[PDB]
């Protein structure tokens, strides 16, 4: 039926294959020995609309959307441009990412790193931590509530911050009830990658001031950033559709300039 169901089937298979090689006990030990997590909440508390910039496999080879293909070099461009956090897509089927891309990014940047994947079981949480993630995406649509709560608790126990992704007002209610500190709204369709313009603006007013509100989709430049800031975004996640013109550093620097301007809408 849904694209999400197919992604999650994929996750279960891909995780089972990794777990056959590196057991749950072994990945828990690897997480426990990893360099400590970086301070995501401090990054998010910095003044101005923060930019989370995303590394993913597919982009146009030329034109206004052209960017850097190599994950380490892209991530470095993002850090150089002033991104507060670098996101790296590790889901393997819809987005053709890999845990190797997380490793490459982690070695390349000294700012916090978000592992952007579809978490369904604790193995993935320890694995994220072992491979250096500081922030972890959790998706309400993927999880039954009690499991969401236990994944959120495990993420936090390991010293990471959860970015809890919601697609509807009811999912936002669930994220709040689960205890989320950071709630992202994703309005992108998994088939087309098009973004519903009304979703953030509808959901965000229901999110209390005590949560950090993230626009996970739809911000492609300063024009969008200003619109989302006015709608209540505290940070924006950019990547898909970003107008980079071959120069992602500059594109991120322009977003930072706009988001930290004293007169930026809010």
UniProtKB/Swiss-Prot annotation:
Gene3D superfamilies: Aldolase class I. It catalyses: 1-(2-carboxyphenylamino)-1-deoxy-D-ribulose 5-phosphate + H(+) = (1S,2R)-1-C-(indol-3-yl)glycerol 3-phosphate + CO2 + H2O. GO terms for cellular component: peptidoglycan-based cell wall; plasma membrane. Pathway: Amino-acid biosynthesis; L-tryptophan biosynthesis; L-tryptophan from chorismate: step 4/5. Disulfide bonds: none annotated. Keywords: Amino-acid biosynthesis, Aromatic amino acid biosynthesis, Decarboxylase, Lyase, Tryptophan biosynthesis. Signal peptide: none annotated. Was identified as a high-confidence drug target. This is Indole-3-glycerol phosphate synthase. The lineage of its organism: Bacteria, Bacillati, Actinomycetota, Actinomycetes, Mycobacteriales. The gene is trpC.
């Amino acid at each position: 039926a849904t694209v999400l169901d197919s992604i999650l089937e994929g996750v279960r298979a891909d995780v089972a294959a990794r777990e056959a090689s590196v057991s749950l006990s072994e990945i828990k030990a690897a997480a426990a020995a990893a360099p400590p997590p970086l301070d995501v909440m401090a990054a998010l508390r910095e003044p101005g609309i923060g930019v989370i910039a995303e590394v993913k496999r597919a982009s146009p080879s030329a034109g206004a959307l052209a960017t850097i293909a190599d994950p380490a070099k892209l991530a470095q461009a993002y850090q150089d441009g002033g991104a507060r956090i670098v996101s790296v897509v590790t889901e393997q089927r819809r987005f053709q990412g890999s845990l190797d891309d997380l490793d490459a990014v982690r070695a390349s940047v000294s700012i916090p790193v978000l592992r952007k994947d579809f978490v369904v079981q604790p193995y993935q949480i320890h694995e994220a931590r072992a491979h250096g993630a500081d922030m972890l995406l959790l998706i309400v649509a993927a999880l039954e509530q009690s499991v969401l709560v236990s994944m959120l608790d495990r993420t936090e126990s390991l010293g990471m911050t959860a970015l809890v992704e919601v697609h509807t007002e009811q999912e936002a209610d669930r994220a709040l009830k689960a205890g989320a500190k950071v709630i992202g709204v994703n309005a992108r369709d998994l088939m087309t990658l098009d973004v519903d313009r009304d979703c953030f603006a509808r959901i965000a007013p229901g999110l209390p001031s005590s949560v950090i509100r993230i626009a996970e989709s739809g911000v492609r430049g300063t024009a969008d950033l200003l619109a989302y800031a006015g709608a209540g975004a505290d940070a924006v996640l950019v990547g898909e559709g970003l107008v980079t013109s071959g120069d992602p550093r500059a594109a991120v620097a322009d977003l930072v300039t706009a988001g930290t301007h004293p007169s930026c809408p809010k």
